[PDB]
Amino acid sequence: XXXXXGRXXXXXPXXXXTXXVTXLXXXXXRXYLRFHXXXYXXXXXXX
Amino acid sequence: TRVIPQVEVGNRKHYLEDKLKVYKQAMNETSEQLVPIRLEFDQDRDRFFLRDTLLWNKND
Numbered sequence: 001x002x003x004x005x006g007r008x009x010x011x012x013p014x015x016x017x018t019x020x021v022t023x024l025x026x027x028x029x030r031x032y033l034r035f036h037x038x039x040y041x042x043x044x045x046x047x
Numbered sequence: 048t049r050v051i052p053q054v055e056v057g058n059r060k061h062y063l064e065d066k067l068k069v070y071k072q073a074m075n076e077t078s079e080q081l082v083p084i085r086l087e088f089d090q091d092r093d094r095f096f097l098r099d100t101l102l103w104n105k106n107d
Binding site for chain 1 (some may be wrong): 060062063
């Protein structure tokens with residue numbers, strides 16, 4: 001019906017500023033250290 | 048009467064950090080180089096299986 005010259009345009013529904021736009025194509029119209037290895041009792045203990 | 052160092056939350060101890068190192072890193076920072084890290088472990092290999100993805104700052 002609406003198809004024009006081999007083009008299948010059929011599958012279409014047919015029934016501030018106020019600009020006007022064209023329809024169908026819109027455009028303007030833990031762990032804490034332990035004592036060892038912490039450097040005491042490694043220089044100490046006079047007993 | 049007792050002296051209790053702390054009460055464990057979720058069966059863990061509280062995390063205590065060094066504030067001087069914190070300020071030293073924070074006051075001399077320039078970039079945030081981020082590394083994508085992927086963890087994948089099967090069972091018919093090392094015994095556990097676990098998969099995860101993560102991002103880690105290398106300048107940390």
